[PDB]
Amino acid sequence: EEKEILWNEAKAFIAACYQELGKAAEVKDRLADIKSEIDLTGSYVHTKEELEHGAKMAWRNSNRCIGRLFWNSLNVIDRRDVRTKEEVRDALFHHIETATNNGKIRPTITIFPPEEKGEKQVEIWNHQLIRYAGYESDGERIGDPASCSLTAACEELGWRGERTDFDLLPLIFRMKGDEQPVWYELPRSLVIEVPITHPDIEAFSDLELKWYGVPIISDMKLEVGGIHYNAAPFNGWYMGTEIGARNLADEKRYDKLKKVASVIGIAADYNTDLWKDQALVELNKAVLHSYKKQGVSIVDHHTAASQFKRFEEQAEEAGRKLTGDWTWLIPPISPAATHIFHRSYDNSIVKPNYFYQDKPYE
Amino acid sequence: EEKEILWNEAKAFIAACYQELGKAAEVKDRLADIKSEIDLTGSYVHTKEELEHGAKMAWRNSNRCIGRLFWNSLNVIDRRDVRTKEEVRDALFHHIETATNNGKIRPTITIFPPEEKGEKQVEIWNHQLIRYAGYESDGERIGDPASCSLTAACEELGWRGERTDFDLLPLIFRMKGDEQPVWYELPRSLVIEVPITHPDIEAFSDLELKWYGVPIISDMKLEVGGIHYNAAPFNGWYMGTEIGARNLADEKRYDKLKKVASVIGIAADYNTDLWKDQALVELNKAVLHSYKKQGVSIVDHHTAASQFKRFEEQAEEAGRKLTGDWTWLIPPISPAATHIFHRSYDNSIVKPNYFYQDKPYE
Numbered sequence: 033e034e035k036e037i038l039w040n041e042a043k044a045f046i047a048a049c050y051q052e053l054g055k056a057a058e059v060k061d062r063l064a065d066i067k068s069e070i071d072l073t074g075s076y077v078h079t080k081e082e083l084e085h086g087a088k089m090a091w092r093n094s095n096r097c098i099g100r101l102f103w104n105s106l107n108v109i110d111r112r113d114v115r116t117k118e119e120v121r122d123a124l125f126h127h128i129e130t131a132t133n134n135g136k137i138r139p140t141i142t143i144f145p146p147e148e149k150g151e152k153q154v155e156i157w158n159h160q161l162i163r164y165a166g167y168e169s170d171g172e173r174i175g176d177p178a179s180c181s182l183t184a185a186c187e188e189l190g191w192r193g194e195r196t197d198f199d200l201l202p203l204i205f206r207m208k209g210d211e212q213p214v215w216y217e218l219p220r221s222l223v224i225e226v227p228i229t230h231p232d233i234e235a236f237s238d239l240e241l242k243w244y245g246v247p248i249i250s251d252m253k254l255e256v257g258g259i260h261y262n263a264a265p266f267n268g269w270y271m272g273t274e275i276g277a278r279n280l281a282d283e284k285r286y287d288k289l290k291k292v293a294s295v296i297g298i299a300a301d302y303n304t305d306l307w308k309d310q311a312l313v314e315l316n317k318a319v320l321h322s323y324k325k326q327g328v329s330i331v332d333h334h335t336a337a338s339q340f341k342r343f344e345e346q347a348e349e350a351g352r353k354l355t356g357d358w359t360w361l362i363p364p365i366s367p368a369a370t371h372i373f374h375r376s377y378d379n380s381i382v383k384p385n386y387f388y389q390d391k392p393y394e
Numbered sequence: 395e396e397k398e399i400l401w402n403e404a405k406a407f408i409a410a411c412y413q414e415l416g417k418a419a420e421v422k423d424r425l426a427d428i429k430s431e432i433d434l435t436g437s438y439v440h441t442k443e444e445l446e447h448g449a450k451m452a453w454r455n456s457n458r459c460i461g462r463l464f465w466n467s468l469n470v471i472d473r474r475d476v477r478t479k480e481e482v483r484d485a486l487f488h489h490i491e492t493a494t495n496n497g498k499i500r501p502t503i504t505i506f507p508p509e510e511k512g513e514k515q516v517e518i519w520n521h522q523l524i525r526y527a528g529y530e531s532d533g534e535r536i537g538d539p540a541s542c543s544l545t546a547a548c549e550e551l552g553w554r555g556e557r558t559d560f561d562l563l564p565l566i567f568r569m570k571g572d573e574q575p576v577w578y579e580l581p582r583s584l585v586i587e588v589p590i591t592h593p594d595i596e597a598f599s600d601l602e603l604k605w606y607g608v609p610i611i612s613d614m615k616l617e618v619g620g621i622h623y624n625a626a627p628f629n630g631w632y633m634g635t636e637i638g639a640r641n642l643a644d645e646k647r648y649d650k651l652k653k654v655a656s657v658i659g660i661a662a663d664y665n666t667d668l669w670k671d672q673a674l675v676e677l678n679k680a681v682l683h684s685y686k687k688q689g690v691s692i693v694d695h696h697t698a699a700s701q702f703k704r705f706e707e708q709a710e711e712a713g714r715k716l717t718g719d720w721t722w723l724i725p726p727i728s729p730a731a732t733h734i735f736h737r738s739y740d741n742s743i744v745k746p747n748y749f750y751q752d753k754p755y756e
C-alpha cells in the first residue's frame with residue numbers, strides 16, 4: 033500500500049507539473065523511470081524543476097492563504113544535500129538572511145531531505161525560525177504564551193532565556209540518529225525587528241512594543257507527488273492584522289488592547305464605546321506605519337484582499353479550480369470591507385500542499 | 395409521501411415539545427388524535443402551547459442567530475384566525491406597535507394561517523415590515539439598493555415613492571384567491587426612527603443619516619412539526635454592526651464610509667491608513683450612541699457575543715446539542731475580539747426552524 037500511494041501520487045503530480053511546464057511529451061518516459069526507482073528503492077527523487085514547481089503548486093493550493101497571487105515567484109532553495117547539523121544550521125541562517133534581504137522580503141523556501149520510511153532526516157522543532165519565548169509560572173506571565181511549551185522544552189536542553197517579553201528562541205532541530213535536538217542561538221545581526229510607534233500619537237512608544245520582521249514557518253510538511261518534505265521552512269511577509277489584531281491583541285497572546293486604549297486616551301470601561309475596536313484600529317495603523325518606516329515589507333488587509341481577488345481572476349482565466357478556506361481568508365478586522373467576506377470558497381484539499389504534522393515535543 | 399412527511403415531522407416535534415414542557419405522558423394520546431386528523435383532513439392543527447413553544451424552539455435552532463440566549467421569552471401572537479386583508483393589515487400594524495413598545499423592544503412573532511396544499515393563505519411580499527425603498531435609473535441611485543426590486547413591484551401596484559433616501563415602503567401582501575397583492579402605507583406614528591449622531595463629533599449630523607428602530611423579518615417560513623407557517627413575521631432588536639457595518643457601510647447598500655471619513659476629519663486616500671476601518675468604528679459608535687440616546691433597544695457585538703456564550707453554556711447544561719453557523723455568528727467588525735471567532739460550531743439543521751422561501755415577485 034505504501035508504494036502504491038506513492039506511485040499514484042507521483043503519476044498525478046508529474047502529469048500536472050509537466051503540463052504546466054509545457055513538458056507534456058516527457059511525462060511517459062519520466063513516469064517509467066520513476067516506476068523503476070520506486071520498484072527498486074521504495075521511493076523516487078525529484079528533479080530540481082519538479083521540486084521547485086511542486087513547492088510553488090503547494091503554495092498555490094494553500095486554501096488558508098490570502099497571499100497566493102505571488103505563488104509563481106517563490107524562491108526555492110534546494111538543500112536536499114545536507115547531512116550534518118552544522119549544514120542544517122547554516123542553511124537556516126542563510127534562509128533568514130536571504131529572505132530578509134535588508135527588509136525587502138523575498139518569499140523563500142528551503143527544502144531539506146524528505147522522509148524515507150516515514151523516517152525524518154531532519155526534524156525541526158521551531159514553529160517559526162524567528163519567534164519570541166514565553167514563560168508562565170506562579171501567576172507570572174512573560175513573553176509569548178504561544179511559545180510556552182517550546183520554551184520549556186528548550187530549557188530542558190541547557191538553554192536559558194533572559195525572560196524579557198521578547199527573547200529570541202534559539203534554532204532547535206534533531207538529526208536522524210540523534211536522540212536529542214541541538215540548539216543554536218540566532219545571530220542578532222540576522223534578525224530585523226520593528227519597534228511599534230504610531231504616526232500621530234507620540235505616547236504609543238511608551239508601550240515598548242516590537243515585532244520581528246520575517247515570519248518563517250518551519251513546522252509544516254510540504255508534500256509533493258507522494259514525497260514528504262517534513263522539513264521545508266518557508267516565509268512570505270506579514271499582513272499587518274496578523275501582528276496588530278492577533279499576536280499583540282489576543283488575550284492568550286500579548287493581550288495589549290487595554291494598554292493601547294490607555295495610551296490613545298480612551299476609556300476601556302463600556303462595551304458600547306467600542307473601545308476594543310478603536311484600540312485594534314490604532315494598533316493596526318501603528319504596525320503598518322512602523323514596518324513602512326523601518327523599510328520592512330508588509331501588506332495591509334485591504335491591499336492583500338485586492339491582490340487575492342486578482343489571484344481568483346488569474347485562476348479562472350488559467351482554467352484552474354480555485355480552492356479556499358473562507359474562515360481563514362477573511363481578515364480579523366473589517367472583514368466585510370473585503371470582497372472575500374461576500375463570496376464563498378470550495379475548501380477541497382488539492383496536492384501538492386503544506387500540511388500540519390505532529391510536534392516532536394510536549 | 396406528503397402526509398407521511400407530515401406524520402413523521404409531527405411525531406418528532408410533539409415528543410420533543412411535550413418533553414420540554416413536562417407533558418411527556420400526554421404524547422401518546424395527542425399523537426393518536428393527530429394521526430386521525432391527518433388521515434381525515436390531510437393536516438393537523440397545533441394547540442396554542444405547541445405553536446408558542448414551536449416558535450421558540452425554531453428561534454433556538456436558528457444557526458445564524460447570535461441573539462438566541464433569549465429564545466424562551468419570545469412573545470408569540472396567534473393570528474391563525476385571520477381571514478380578511480383588513481385583519482392581516484391590522485395584525486401587522488399591531489405587531490409593529492407592540493414590538494416597538496415605545497423603544498423598549500419586545501421580541502415578538504405574529505403567526506398567520508399556515509399553508510394547506512402548499513397553498514398560501516396569506517403571502518407577505520415585504521422583506522421586513524419596516525424598510526426603506528430603493529431606486530436606480532440612469533446613473534441615479536436613491537435609497538436602499540437592496541429594496542430596488544420590491545420598490546419596483548410596488549410602483550406597479552399604484553404606489554409611488556417620494557424618492558428620498560429613506561422612503562418607508564408600504565405593507566404589501568396577497569390573500570389566497572386574490573391575483574394581486576394589496577398595499578397599505580405605514581402610519582408614521584407607529585414607526586420609530588433614530589437620527590444618527592456621534593457622541594464627540596458634532597459634524598456627524600451633517601451626513602443626515604438615520605435608521606428605523608425595529609427590524610421585523612416578514613419573508614421567512616416558520617416550520618413546526620410539518621406545518622408550514624409561510625407568513626409569520628418576527629422581530630428582535632438590532633445588533634449595532636448590522637446597521638453600522640453593513641446597511642450603512644456596504645458598497646451595495648448606503649455606501650457611506652467615504653462620507654464618514656470626511657466628517658471625522660481623516661483622509662480616505664491610502665489603504666495603509668486603515669481609513670475604512672476607522673470610519674467603520676466611528677460610524678458604529680455613532681449608531682450605538684444614537685439608539686441609546688433615543689431610548690431604543692440595541693446591543694453591541696461584544697455584549698451580544700457575551701450573551702451568546704451564555705446561550706452555549708445553557709445548552710450544555712440542559713443537555714442539548716448546540717448548532718451554529720460560524721460564518722454568520724462572527725460580527726463583521728473585530729470578530730477575533732469575540733470568543734465565537736475562536737471556536738467552531740456544528741451547522742446541522744434542526745427543526746422547528748425558520749427557512750428561506752421563494753419571493754412572490756421578480
Ligand code: HEM
Pocket residue numbers: 087091094096097098099100102106139140141266267268269270271274331336360386
Ligand atoms: C508573500 C506574502 C504572504 C502573505 C502576505 C501571506 C498571508 C497569509 C496569511 C495572513 C495567512 C494566515 C495566517 C494566520 O492567520 O495565522 C497565511 C496562511 C498561509 N500561508 Fe500565506 N502569505 C504569504 C506567503 C506565503 C508563502 C510564501 C507560503 C508558502 C510557500 C504560504 C503558505 C501559507 C500557508 C500554508 C498558510 C496556512 C497556515 C496554516 O494553516 O496554519 N504563504 N498566509
Ligand code: HEM
Pocket residue numbers: 449453456458459460461462464468501502503628629630631632633636693698722748
Ligand atoms: C433579541 C434580539 C436579537 C438579536 C440581537 C439578534 C441578532 C441577530 C443577528 C445579528 C443576525 C444576523 C443578521 C444578518 O447579518 O443579516 C440574526 C439572524 C437571525 N436571527 Fe436573530 N436576533 C435577535 C432575535 C431574533 C428573533 C426574535 C428571531 C426569531 C424568532 C431570530 C431569528 C433569527 C434568524 C432566523 C436569523 C437568520 C436570518 C437569515 O438566515 O437570513 N432572531 N440574529
Ligand SMILES: N=C(Nc1cccc(COC[C@@H](CN)OCc2cccc(/N=C(/N)c3cccs3)c2)c1)c1cccs1
Pocket residue numbers: 247248249266267268269270271274388
Ligand atoms: N490546530 C492544530 N494544531 C495547531 C495548534 C496550534 C497552532 C497551529 C498553527 O497555527 C497557525 C498559524 C497561527 N494562527 O501560524 C502562523 C502563520 C501561518 C502561516 C502564515 C503566517 N503568516 C505569514 N504571513 C507567513 C508565514 C510564512 C509564509 S507567509 C503565519 C496548529 C490541530 C489540533 C488537532 C489537529 S490539528
Ligand SMILES: N=C(Nc1cccc(COC[C@@H](CN)OCc2cccc(/N=C(/N)c3cccs3)c2)c1)c1cccs1
Pocket residue numbers: 609610611628629630631632633636750
Ligand atoms: N440567499 C438567498 N436568498 C436571499 C437573498 C438576499 C437576501 C436574503 C436574506 O438576507 C438575510 C439578512 C440580510 N443580511 O436579512 C436581514 C436580517 C435577518 C435576520 C435578522 C436580522 N436582524 C435582527 N436583529 C432581527 C430581525 C428579526 C429578528 S432579529 C436581519 C436571502 C438565496 C439564493 C439561492 C438560494 S438561497
Ligand SMILES: C[C@H](O)[C@H](O)[C@H]1CNc2nc(N)[nH]c(=O)c2N1
Pocket residue numbers: 373374375376721722723
Ligand atoms: C458569502 C458569505 O457567506 C456572506 O458574505 C455572509 C458572511 N457572513 C454574514 N454574516 C451575517 N451576520 N450577515 C451576512 O449578511 C453575512 N454574509
Ligand SMILES: C[C@H](O)[C@H](O)[C@H]1CNc2nc(N)[nH]c(=O)c2N1
Pocket residue numbers: 359360361735736737738
Ligand atoms: C475556530 C476558528 O476556525 C479559528 O478561530 C480561526 C478563525 N480564522 C482564522 N483565520 C486566520 N487567518 N488565522 C487564525 O488563526 C484563525 N483562527
Ligand SMILES: [Cl-]
Pocket residue numbers: 247274279
Ligand atoms: Cl505570526
Ligand SMILES: [Cl-]
Pocket residue numbers: 609636641
Ligand atoms: Cl437589517
